Symmetry: C6
Subunit: 204 residues, 6 copies
């Protein structure tokens, strides 16, 4: 996945995740980012190049592909990954800033949420759940479910009447779409349990 | 985004941003640079290859694409990012130079603007606001709003009369254009508040 | 293989493998990841570009390629490598966590499985065997053996009657498929012997 | 811009630039090299692929492109950047060599030109000015100004009579050509002032 | 050759090669891996794209290319390099493991083979010779000598009768094939002399 | 130029070059390797893709390109650079090995050739001159001078009679060929003077 300096970033975030945030970070890096960069991205390489329409109308292929794929699946996943990673990155900085200041004023134990960290950790989990569900909704309603069809019927101008068009690798894209949605749903469940851990402690 | 040496550069600039400059740096790196290199750039990959014109005139596609896209959006964003990052890069050097000299003559506290740093920080914010607004204006008047059309009508020589041409992925490009403009506008608001913080202190 | 930071990751996992896990790590990195990254991936570069069908029907090539290659071989291997590497990555973290805590409470000997590490090492080997056999089963039944044919007969809509189609580099792909399957079978045998080593110790 | 080891190279040259050479280094790295690698290079990607000539003569497109673009603009800029960077790279080594020997025989102050460094610094600036003006002259006379035309008229063999040919992205290339020339002219002015600083000191 | 971390790997293996293994490592890295990465690989880039067959039969080009190039030369060389490097990589670890343990139980001299290292070094040389000769044999009998022909005559189904086909860059591929074979033969001679050095010592 | 770890390699060789070998190393890295990687390589990208022949004979383009470009210019330069760099790389190791042993038995002065280093340095320069002249001869006689022609006349089978073919970017390739030859000739003169420095000392 290129870059090169994960060990600092991956190591930095790892040291500042309480109990489940370490499990969440593994699922995020290995099964969402690694899948996207190593397998999924090349699958969508020829999405418009291999888009085939049964017509002789110039410009009909351009508007039919645009109508049915307003935003690419891989571009949607890249935006979603950036949005869910930001609250985790910000909070991990807060723990390092809180720890450094106390050490300066003054035993590497587990990360504990006791003071001002409560309102930043709880909000970060809330933002992660909201962002994750928002992108799942966009995926469902924009593409009419998680299955890609071989044939799309298009009647936008300048296509005469209805034109038949054919998608490239629809089955492979369905397999990867289901994988991302399922892993995304797992991350939602992981975040909810972390809320349950915190809420019962406050209620107790 | 390749490179590899961000941790020094990102870490260096981060340590020398007062209060909002740290929020500004996050929005710049994560939501402007990361989007451009990971999602936006591949969207514009086939801008001229998939440009289709309904004509038989040789050379008509070349002049019509040039007329309606004098400079690509991604090339415009790359220039804008370079121009806004330079004042921040220079001032971060000034803080490190001011701090180092005092240490040589001789408590890592927050960055404070008290002496000659006042005329460099204030000018840096002023330049960033001016650069940000200048590029937003160029985007609006060159492309006639932030929405990309499916069809462009072209009558430049040697095209006979008016020729219909069709843009590649107009909807995807509109979505990313709105995202950059919205994030660019947020950075303008963040810079203005930093001016308000400094101006009231001087007025007090 | 790009990346750049194996030496930390490869060095980290190597130091925490008992006797056979060091042989397993060599076979995994050198004969599965190196083969896929350096040789296999470019073999599948033109899988659909050089797919040729004897027909004049628009859209027939798209549905016939999708029917016979629902998921690419290289994308299947990438998923399999990620799934088998995860249990080994997790357990290597457990050994480092178990060792670090003892040092904090307080002779670099070989890795020994005596306490809570028994239920994590044994499950890690069990998961690796199950994952390895599941992907070998998918390879066999999805593609009807490990040999790729030169000609595939396709009758899916919209292809009229049965259409003859021709695969790109079928012999090269067969050679690499047999190589990956054989190395995958070796890793299964290596894991089973490690179970035999542990089970006799518990039974004794 | 790939590479990865700038921090050593950029850091090394930065520490050995007197007053203006630090401003010169910023303009060189940020507005000449960064522009070339991030924006300019992809603009010239399809210079010959999208070169279109209104003719049926085989081989006419090859000789007409060669006639009007004997050497590409980006390749010209790459050569110019290498030539201007070499004198600065060499002199920066001289300062480090002069400083190291004094330390071995034996207060990090500003770089001062007093002894044998006078004839190396002065010649380095002179070579940089001469190289910069020579490449600006080549740009002007080879391409007949800094504006690229949409249409070129070609009559070289084997093209029959005069053939009309059309350039790819002429407006975008004009924008980047004007930018590089203007920044190159700024570097000339910066170097001349450094000569004025040194010459008055010697005359005094 | 991309990667980035040879200096650790190259430095590690270099420090653990007796007398000729240092000469062997230079020939392997510089004249086998560097040539393949930098020069040879791009020569085979258009092997099937520029494969031309004088026919109108659909699918005839696919089966004729497959028949005459079952596995590409560059893919064959990549497999051979991996197989010959593994015994050297493993033995270098044994020397470092033997040296480290004795130091822990307890003068950086030359590498000496006296104890258990005898059966690992001798087998490593034997495996390297066997692997090198096996791949040379495969190259000879698969491609009928080391010279690539311009024309190949193909009669496999569905090609009607015998079809003439033309290879891309046959002369350049012949030059690089002879270079690898000659360098491969040198490595065989180097390994044999190392056996002669060891065998006479044991016989004495 | 990718890679990433020149600073160790470039720094290592730099510290072990007597007087002229430092100038030689600069010319080699900056004006031979930099030019080839950054400018020359992309010029030859479409050498066969844009090779155009005025004919209807299938396979005629393949044999005519092969006849007139048996080895690519860039592939020739890559081989030459590897051959000339090897003697300098080997000798730099000898200086470090000779120096390290003295330190172990035991004032960083200039590199001096007094003992066994005489027969390795002198042979290294002799090999470099011989290799440099050998590749100059191959360039001249294989391509009939250093100027590339627009038109090549080809009569090899299966081309009927003589076929006219047209080269891609012949003028740009001539400019870079002359540059490499001139810089290569400078390196020959630099090596000869180093022989003159050594020979007079021995004769004295
Ligand atoms: C941490 C744990 C995370 C777990 C996440 C699990 C994700 C599940 C991955 C597999 C997804 C399977 C369901 C989606 C695919 C539905 C379509 C399907 O099954 O296609 C059939 C063949 O598929 C195939 O042959 C596909 C087989 C895939 C093998 C497994 C890959 C891994 C052909 O059926 P059709 O002709 O109706 O296809 C209509 C499409 N155009
Ligand atoms: C830090 C915070 C930063 C916040 C920044 C916010 C940026 C907003 C991103 C979404 C932009 C939406 C508005 C621009 C797109 C207008 C066109 C549009 O909505 O297209 C319709 C469907 O769009 C779609 O289906 C596109 C939906 C995009 C989903 C969300 C992506 C993230 C089709 O309507 P039409 O047929 O008239 O299209 C005419 C175009 N050719
Ligand atoms: C750690 C240890 C790991 C060991 C792993 C071992 C893996 C074995 C690798 C070699 C695989 C050979 C068997 C699979 C290929 C079957 C097809 C075959 O032999 O093709 C024939 C020529 O093959 C050839 O010419 C292929 C020769 C391959 C040379 C060796 C490559 C390394 C042509 O036969 P056909 O015309 O019927 O082909 C029908 C295909 N379309
Ligand atoms: C450190 C400081 C460094 C300062 C460097 C300053 C560099 C200046 C960059 C802008 C260059 C503008 C002048 C050159 C372009 C002349 C052609 C021109 O303006 O084109 C018109 C539209 O251009 C446009 O719309 C181009 C607008 C560019 C927006 C700004 C980009 C940044 C169409 O005019 P036409 O139809 O006659 O075009 C004839 C070309 N084929
Ligand atoms: C450590 C030391 C390692 C030493 C390794 C030595 C490797 C030797 C490399 C050169 C290989 C030359 C012999 C193989 C090529 C035979 C064909 C040949 O010479 O082609 C003729 C022109 O070639 C040419 O003009 C090719 C000249 C190559 C120049 C040197 C490149 C380095 C045209 O003859 P033809 O028309 O019959 O060609 C029939 C092919 N289709
Ligand atoms: C350390 C110091 C190293 C110094 C090395 C010096 C290397 C010299 C580089 C310049 C090479 C110039 C001579 C070779 C090119 C001869 C052909 C030539 O001049 O072409 C004419 C236009 O060229 C042009 O317009 C070419 C201008 C090149 C500008 C300078 C680039 C740097 C058109 O003449 P024609 O139509 O007869 O062309 C016949 C070709 N097809």
């Amino acid at each position: 996945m290129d870059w090169g300096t994960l060990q600092t970033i991956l190591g930095g975030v790892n040291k500042h995740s309480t109990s489940i945030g370490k499990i969440w970070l593994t699922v995020l890096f290995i099964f969402r980012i690694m899948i996207l960069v190593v397998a999924a991205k090349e699958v969508w390489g020829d999405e418009q190049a291999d888009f085939v329409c049964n017509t002789l109308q110039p410009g009909c292929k351009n508007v039919c592909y645009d109508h049915y794929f307003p935003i690419s699946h891989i571009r949607l996943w890249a935006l979603q990954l950036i949005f869910v990673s930001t609250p985790a990155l910000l909070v991990a900085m807060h723990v390092a800033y809180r720890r450094h200041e106390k050490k300066r004023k003054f035993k590497t134990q587990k990360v504990r949420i006791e003071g001002s960290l409560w309102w930043t950790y709880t909000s970060s989990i809330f933002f992660r759940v909201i962002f994750e569900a928002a992108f799942m909704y966009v995926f469902y309603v924009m593409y009419d479910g998680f299955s890609m069809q071989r044939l799309v019927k298009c009647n936008a101008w300048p296509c005469p009447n209805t034109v038949d068009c054919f998608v490239s690798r629809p089955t492979e894209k369905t397999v990867f779409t289901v994988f991302m949605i399922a892993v995304s749903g797992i991350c939602i469940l992981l975040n909810v349990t972390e809320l349950c851990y915190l809420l019962i402690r406050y209620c107790s």
